[PDB]
Amino acid sequence: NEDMPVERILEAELAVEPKPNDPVTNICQAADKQLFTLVEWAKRIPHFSELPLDDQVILLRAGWNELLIASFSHRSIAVKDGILLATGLHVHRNSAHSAGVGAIFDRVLTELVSKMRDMQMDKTELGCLRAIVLFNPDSKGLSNPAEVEALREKVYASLEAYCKHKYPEQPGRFAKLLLRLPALRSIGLKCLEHLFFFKLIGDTPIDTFLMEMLEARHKILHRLLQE
Amino acid sequence: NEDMPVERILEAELAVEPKPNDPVTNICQAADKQLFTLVEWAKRIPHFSELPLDDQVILLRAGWNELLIASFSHRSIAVKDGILLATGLHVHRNSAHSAGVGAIFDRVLTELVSKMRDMQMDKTELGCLRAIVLFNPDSKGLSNPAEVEALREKVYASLEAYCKHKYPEQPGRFAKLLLRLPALRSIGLKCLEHLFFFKLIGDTPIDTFLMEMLEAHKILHRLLQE
Amino acid sequence: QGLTEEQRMMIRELMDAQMKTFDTTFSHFKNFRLPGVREEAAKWSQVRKDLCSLKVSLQLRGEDGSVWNYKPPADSGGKEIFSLLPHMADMSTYMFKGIISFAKVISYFRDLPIEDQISLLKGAAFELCQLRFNTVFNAETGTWECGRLSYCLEDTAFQQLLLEPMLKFHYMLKKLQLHEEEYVLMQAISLFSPDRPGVLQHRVVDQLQEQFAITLKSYIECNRPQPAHRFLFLKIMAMLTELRSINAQHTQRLLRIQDIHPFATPLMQELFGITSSLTERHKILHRLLQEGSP
Amino acid sequence: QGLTEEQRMMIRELMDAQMKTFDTTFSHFKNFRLPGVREEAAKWSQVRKDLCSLKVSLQLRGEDGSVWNYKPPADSGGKEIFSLLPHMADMSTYMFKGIISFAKVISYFRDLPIEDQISLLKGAAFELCQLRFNTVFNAETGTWECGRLSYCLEDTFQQLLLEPMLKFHYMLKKLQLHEEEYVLMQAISLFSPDRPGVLQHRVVDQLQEQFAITLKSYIECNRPQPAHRFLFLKIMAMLTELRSINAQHTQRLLRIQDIHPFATPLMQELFGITSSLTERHKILHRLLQEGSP
Ligand SMILES: [Mg+2]
Ligand SMILES: [Mg+2]
């Protein structure tokens, strides 16, 4: 309903964007750059801030990868072929396979980019999906998953009403939107496997925030939420 | 001591017995004859009778054959070979083996009669041992075993004092008297095994009181009512 | 009920396949192995972590009512915690074989190229297996009642064994009180998954998956009380989402165990790729997908 | 410690015999088999009766700390009551062997003719087995804790005492006897002159009397008094009931064997299942000599 206002999620999306030099480094820097933005976007989602701080920390640490992935996957609609980073950087197939991340690249294109493109997914829908991903009650260490759950299904309800209102010609658009979650999860895990492998070597100049997200106090994330 | 007088048991034993054919029949009418006698004797024991009548009939139904066996085994002491009965009958080896009860006969002979012979067991001690057998508290169906154990223990103490006093020369006589209980038990078993077997066949006397003992009441029950 | 003819056709089909390929009494689970009557050390600690939380008592009833009850050993320092692995392997293989039969019976799966069948089955085996196990899982007593067999979870003092995503998954899936149709629909969704590594007919698989998802959504919409069960689809989707994590982590865990202690059946070795072309790489799987020889 | 030299010599010899020939951990009870993973019917009812009493669960360990636990089936299911019989047979055989060894080590028993050894062993085998089973018996949990193995009485409570054997075990355990007292009971019942085929009746009689007197003296010397004065009496009551139990068992096991063969050859010899003495007891006779390996 109007308790989790979909338009507020939309402007939460709009407030955080308007837009082989070791492509691995590039992706890491892009991610790090987008983690602070991810914190702000998080704080812009209704009720996320009136949760226990540590619960916010938990949700963000559990969802950050999937969230960023959804973000750039939706950004790469505009371009024909490849993946558009938040640093205005266009990563293509050849370098992705040359970087040893070709498979996950292709899977991201087909499962996310392609699907988001054909389905004509707008940004309030994307924001609702990412909000759903964010409010995951099954995360470890949650002081209380019940509120998180309520929020998740509020986003759910708002999104379903939104799809009913906006796309009456597409009766099964909502289910199709929700159907992306398992695919996104596998992609997220598979990206984590990489980030850990690339970090294990130390080949790539990883950055502070990303390193904090990859390690399991922590400092940074706990700071950016006090504001 | 005084709650279980040894002389009371002795007189219980004295007021009860001062003094073609077929042997199976004989042993039967003999046991039968000695059953009422046995009830009288039992009624002569201190505290046997303020007992719940049910517990009494249970005790008697449990120990009767051991009591009778011990009794005639002690009786046959006077006689040489063979076993003397309460009917004045003198059953011998050949007859017992011909009757099919030769084994148990030999067993009763060498395990009881001979042991009572050499050990020179008296009727006071016989009475006490039979009182021990009678007061068997580990008999199922009792309403209050406790009393039964207690009585058994009293008889035990009295008998031990009796043996220590009267027979100072032989320190281990009491234990030897108690040592006759497992022997008497296995014998009482083997006897019943013959009786049930003889009840089956029908060629032998029904005997009525003995019959009642060979079942799972009223005769015994009324005999105790006086 | 309240669906189009094609949707009810899908449901009837899935129900038929489940019915024909899922022995819930486990009467044909026979001849299974029973438990007998530097980096090495660190990884060893890892595998130990893996097994410590997943200990179960093995209850086995007999024809006459006799029940043999196995209890696992407390953790020491060697094989003593790898005692159920052969049995677990046999059970897993039986279940997998059942899953393959299930996939075969369905027409849509049967119309797909053999390579895509291989890929889809590879990607969804453990998931479908887990779902079916949730079908016979008893949340009340914490036991998997597999007809004659029963796998009861071992105590520790419950709230701390939900720190294992699999057990928590079974409890949370069993709390949902699903109908058979919903279970088999979940199985259909996870089975027909386009994101699976070696799929070629991505189009068809995608169309099918979306159709099954919409069929499920509509089934919840029409065959359950209106506002009591509106977020049910959301919870089911969350389940299908965590199922992925479970699958990946189970794969790597099984890998870590097999690495220091081989135990896994050839079919398991194939379903998790333990040593190309798809058919030579999965000769057993591939053989099972062709019929017959009965 | 008020005994003569010969008396404490007996006790020492007996304690040593027990210690050597009784394995309380049952570590050498191996290779045993386990339960599967008109008038005829009139007998069937009786044997049924015989069995639904002694229902015990077979708990088995371990040494990884695993516990295989077997629970017997409900009655019928006919023939499903004979599931523990083979295992019980192997167990009985192992116990009987231990008892035989116990008889061999003892000097007095060794000085008897082999025939009297056979007769005595036959007569007191089961009794000795029960006395040796009572020491590992737990009265609280109703369990025979045979080291690794455990045999636990299954519930229905007061109706467990209506079976003379269980009642025997509880009653005997309640006396809280010492090891000396146990081995002396074993000595008394082993050296029973009233056994069927005893030729050296007199010697056996003498030995038994000496053992009984020794036990009595032990009771009056190493127990408080008068706290344990009727102790010898209760013990003699146990040796008395043990006869009834011996016979009752024998006949019962016969009635089970008749319709369902399970007894080991040793049990067959000991209990007369299927003339001369040694010929009839080849295995026993053979165990009473030394030595092939
Ligand atoms: Mg290259
Ligand atoms: Mg003749």
Short mmCIF file of C-alpha atoms in Angstrom, two decimals, chain D residues 7 43 116 128 130-132 138 146 154 168 214 219 260:
data_model
loop_
_atom_site.label_atom_id
_atom_site.label_comp_id
_atom_site.label_asym_id
_atom_site.label_seq_id
_atom_site.Cartn_x
_atom_site.Cartn_y
_atom_site.Cartn_z
CA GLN D 7 39.22 -70.69 55.21
CA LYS D 43 2.43 -75.44 22.80
CA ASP D 116 31.96 -85.67 39.07
CA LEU D 128 26.68 -69.84 38.41
CA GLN D 130 23.03 -66.07 37.07
CA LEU D 131 25.32 -65.31 40.01
CA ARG D 132 27.92 -63.95 37.57
CA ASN D 138 21.99 -52.58 37.47
CA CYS D 146 28.08 -56.31 30.30
CA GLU D 154 11.55 -53.40 28.64
CA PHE D 168 15.90 -63.13 41.87
CA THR D 214 33.44 -70.24 55.69
CA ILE D 219 29.45 -62.77 57.32
CA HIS D 260 12.46 -73.76 17.49
#
